[PDB]
């Protein structure tokens, strides 16, 4: 089966780390030299990675039963979560560098409740299926991430959405994280899909793939024939090629920007990524901007 990406403009697609519309293309700051997002992770042949779900209706959500002290997590459909197969239940939020505010609702009861999540305390062990209730009364809930705020610890830290939380361990490997993603070098930088996230700041949440890309790839399951997929970012109204990109098998895109003030970040979001051909990982891209 020939490899494809959805024929839809980016501006109509969703972030894969929270249910938010995509508003820009971004690159990371210079001091961000790898990311380890656990949501929004899918291979080019459609293998879900980390805690990534197929559908946005599972993204940045939690489900569990509070006893007033802890929330014992399950998967979103209520079936038990089995520890040590991943860092958390499928869809569990992966936003490091902030406090979470999760809107909790219940089946068969009225009302919603704001659940405030510090991801640093020793009680935050999602990889073992348990997180602190922090005042949430006894009951079964479903929660979705609603807004974020500066992290409670270390006090005074800025929000840093390039990180993931510590899922509750003193050894990195214990939580079975999806592996880190690195810029390949030689002028290629990772491309991120940005979404504005509510909260008391100008919060921009980056992800590696739009959620609609993920459900497309998971459905197509096209064999990854080449070492890299050469893409064109195309204006659908004119058909003009706005820049070359490479998608790598692990499920991320790159480009040669030739500038952070003149590059992919300045591209319009009404464009479409179109597969051109399989190329070598050593294929040298033309710079996007000037």
């Amino acid at each position, epitope marked *: 089966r020939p490899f494809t990406l959805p024929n839809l403009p980016l501006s109509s697609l969703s972030n894969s780390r929270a249910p938010l519309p995509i508003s820009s293309i971004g690159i990371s700051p210079d001091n961000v030299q790898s990311v380890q997002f656990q949501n929004g992770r899918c291979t080019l042949d459609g293998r879900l990675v980390g805690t990534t779900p197929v559908s946005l209706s599972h993204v940045a959500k939690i489900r569990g039963t509070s006893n007033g002290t802890v929330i014992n997590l399950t998967e979103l459909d209520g079936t038990p979560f089995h520890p040590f197969e991943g860092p958390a239940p499928i869809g569990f939020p992966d936003l490091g560098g902030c406090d979470w505010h999760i809107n909790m609702t219940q089946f068969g009861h009225s009302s919603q409740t704001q659940y405030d999540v510090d991801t640093t305390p*020793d009680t935050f062990v999602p990889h073992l299926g348990s997180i602190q209730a922090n005042g949430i009364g006894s009951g079964n809930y479903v929660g979705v991430l609603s807004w974020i705020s500066p*992290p409670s610890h270390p006090s005074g830290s800025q929000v840093d959405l390039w990180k993931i939380p*510590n899922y509750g361990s003193s*050894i*990195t490997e214990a939580t079975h994280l999806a592996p880190s993603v690195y810029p390949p070098g030689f002028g290629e930088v990772l491309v991120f899909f940005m979404s504005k996230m509510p909260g008391p700041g100008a919060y921009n949440l980056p992800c590696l793939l739009p959620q609609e890309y993920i459900s497309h790839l998971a459905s197509e399951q096209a064999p990854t024939v080449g070492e890299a997929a050469l893409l064109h970012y195309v204006d659908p109204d004119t058909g003009r090629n706005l820049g070359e990109f490479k998608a790598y098998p692990d499920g991320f895109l790159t480009c040669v920007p030739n500038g952070a003030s003149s590059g992919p970040q300045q591209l319009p979001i009404n464009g479409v990524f179109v597969f051109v051909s399989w190329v070598s990982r050593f294929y040298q891209l033309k710079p996007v901007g000037t």
Partner: nanobody
Amino acid sequence: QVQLQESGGGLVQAGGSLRLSCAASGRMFSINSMGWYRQAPGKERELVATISEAGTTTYADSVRGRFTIARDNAKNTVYLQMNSLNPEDTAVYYCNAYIQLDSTIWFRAYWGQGTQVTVSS
């Protein structure tokens, strides 16, 4: 693994002094604040003193002026000298540290095993 090893503490007469020390070890990418907490049986855990990596110190109201927190960044060690101890200071004292396991991962709070401090009258 991240490990916090505390030493010191013990029995002292009211008005006396005591010193606590705690060493952080293991594979880690960054350490932020280090501090001391205490908990007596039947009571809740409370902050005693913290010290940031720049050296900024914060103290609880009940111990300010009496206790002194110090830190050696090269050895990842935090120290607590407690002066003018009274019987209400009797508790298990816990070492605390916010550690970043890797560059891609956020901070986590880690705790020591606990050291008993007993002030008799």
